[PDB]
Design a binder for this molecule. Structure first.
Ligand SMILES: Nc1nc2c(ncn2[C@@H]2O[C@H](COP(=O)(O)OP(=O)(O)OP(=O)(O)O)[C@@H](O)[C@H]2O)c(=O)[nH]1
Ligand SMILES: Nc1nc2c(ncn2[C@@H]2O[C@H](COP(=O)(O)OP(=O)(O)OP(=O)(O)O)[C@@H](O)[C@H]2O)c(=O)[nH]1
Lengths: 359, 360
């Protein structure tokens, strides 16, 4: 069977997506697209189509290298206008039509551990058009809810709007679809979840499968940080010898072998250090994500932060409240950043006391 | 020739320091400010000075008896049961200033400056009238009460408390030379001298005014304490450049007590007075702060413009800016941010203070 990967300019976490595309940003020393295609190759999908409407030549580049690395083919669906999230299915519809076999369609912003063959089992057990994945959240008033009958998993109704408490369960971003669904899908830029899932739930074709746990949509920067926390938890009780252990290391940290840490510094819990980063002496880093080539100078304090590529955080810099730095941001010595989403190629010489955007 | 120091009571401003030790007893560049005034006063040649205290301060009593043995000048202590203000202390010690017909100094405790005692005696002897006032420049006339002055005599025609008319640049410097007749005016009930006694003295024009050249600061408040510490280290660099401590990780004019211990690989920036017995650990940046005695600042901290009290414990990766006055025996937990936090003594902070407020 084949699989779609859903293109263009993820508007959230904007200081990272302005430099490289949203599926290409490193999530625990690996791009999220690489995670999804590793799990797809572990499932057994022989080729996977990655729709892209934003002109992404570097995604062509690294993806051709990954075709050559991993042993599965990849087809490149290219759109000149944004066709949304259903229009990518109808552009590549003659490829999914020439084998009558159910195909995955995947969102890129979702990290979890992926029950692909169990969802194939489920789609083979219920035996209709399309199946969804659903998960639990703590906050029903932020996401659209799905009603689910016990022992069947059928979706009676699909609600986009909260505040009614009809359901706990939330869309998880994987769908499994038949080609008859693809007959229904339409080339003009409509999104799939807005109507094509609404008539399919109204007609009752849609069924729902539930995950165990560890789901995150990391389309937002604070959601990126909570997803990185839960991914380091899942790496802790799945691959405990891949996380780095040390005397000045607290909790679960992921450190790349090209990364260097100076001595007498306290790397706190839940932080991924990218390849080639330079941490000097006296730097406390808890709950942050430091992408590639980002040098953090001595005696800094960093909590809940996204440090972009080729950054230079100076000495005695305090950064808290998920301040995202873009690419090549030069933070001067002895500053304080709180909520500062800083655009790429900026130089900061002033403290940012409340959350605002620096451009 | 004698002198009187007004050191009565609790200075409301800089209240987290005044709550544990008295205001003249607070360490100003590793020395109490009253030791500064009595040491320069003994450099003048005054044989005994009187200090008039309303607050019971037994620690000031025993510290001054020690300093009496130290410098070799006598000290009698005027004791008040209720507050007598600033004119009442003159009237309670009025016979000890009335024994001998000779002009005496009276001196505010909060003033730190470069003390021209001999030139002031020469100016008072030259002009030959009742009272002599030191005046100074300020950059900011709309906070402090102004004094008019004619050139080449220095007489004060008019004493104005309220600013915002710009009739004068100069303001009072807390330094007066008074004759015994001025004391003969002063009554025993608690008025303050600068509010009426100097006003009628200037009204019949007996008051004369003398200018300094520079380096004056009333340090009653905490931000004024910091900027007076900065200007004192300026003047002390320019007179005693051997006494400030030079180092590779030391920037600017830094005074460090010999009992202080400074850790490896830390940059202590300009205008820092480090008290006796303080422990600065590795990677700690201190600029423009004054750290009073026995206070420990743990590793990788950042400190700008701050007053760290006695026996404090500033933790690790704490940032302290915008005058975060710590009292005595304040522990600050690690990884916190203090901005404007005037913290009362014996407090433990586990919460970041983002805006200036008082912690009690
Ligand atoms: N290739 C193509 N991909 C698209 C287009 N629009 C959305 N996508 C993809 O649709 C997937 C899911 O949509 P969203 O969750 O809203 O993500 P997004 O489009 O990045 O938008 P934000 O994350 O809110 O900034 C994402 O992986 C997008 O890359 C498009 O017009 N062309
Ligand atoms: N001994 C005695 N000293 C007094 C009394 N009132 C004021 N003083 C002293 O008067 C001097 C100058 O007065 P201020 O400049 O207003 O200082 P302060 O009384 O400490 O008040 P603040 O500094 O604003 O808190 C200070 O050195 C005080 O110690 C008093 O009632 N008894």
């Amino acid at each position: 069977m084949k699989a779609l990967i859903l293109g263009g300019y993820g508007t959230r976490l904007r200081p990272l997506t302005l430099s490289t595309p949203k599926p290409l940003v490193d999530f625990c020393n690996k791009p999220i697209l690489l995670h999804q295609v590793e799990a797809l190759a572990a499932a057994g999908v022989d080729h996977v189509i990655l729709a892209v409407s934003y002109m992404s030549q570097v995604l062509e580049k690294e993806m051709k290298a990954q075709e050559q690395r991993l042993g599965i083919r990849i087809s490149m669906s290219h759109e000149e206008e944004p066709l949304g999230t259903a229009g990518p299915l109808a552009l590549a519809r003659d490829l999914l039509s020439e084998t009558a076999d159910p195909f995955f369609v995947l969102n890129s912003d979702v990290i979890c551990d992926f029950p692909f063959q169990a969802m194939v089992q489920f789609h083979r057990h219920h035996g209709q058009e399309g199946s969804i994945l659903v998960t639990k959240v703590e906050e029903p008033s932020k996401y659209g809810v799905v009603v689910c009958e016990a022992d069947t998993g059928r979706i009676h109704r699909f609600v986009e709007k909260p505040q009614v408490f009809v359901s706990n369960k939330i869309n998880a971003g994987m769908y499994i679809l038949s080609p008859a669904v693809l007959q229904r899908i339409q080339l003009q830029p409509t999104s799939i979840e807005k109507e094509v899932f609404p008539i399919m739930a109204k007609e009752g074709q849609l069924y729902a499968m539930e995950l165990q746990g560890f789901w995150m949509d990391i389309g937002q920067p604070k959601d990126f940080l909570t997803g990185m926390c839960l991914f380091l938890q899942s790496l802790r009780q799945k691959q405990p010898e891949r996380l780095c252990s040390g005397p000045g290391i607290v909790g679960n940290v992921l450190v790349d072998p090209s990364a260097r840490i100076g001595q007498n510094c306290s790397i706190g819990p839940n932080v991924s250090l990218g390849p080639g980063v330079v941490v000097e002496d006296g730097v406390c880093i808890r709950r942050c994500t430091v992408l590639r080539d980002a040098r953090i100078r001595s005696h800094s304090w960093l909590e809940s932060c996204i440090v972009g590529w080729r950054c230079r955080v100076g000495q005695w810099v305090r950064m808290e409240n998920v301040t995202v730095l873009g690419e090549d941001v030069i933070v001067n010595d002895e500053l304080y950043l709180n909520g500062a989403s800083v655009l790429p190629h900026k130089s900061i010489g002033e403290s940012v006391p409340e959350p605002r955007i620096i451009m």
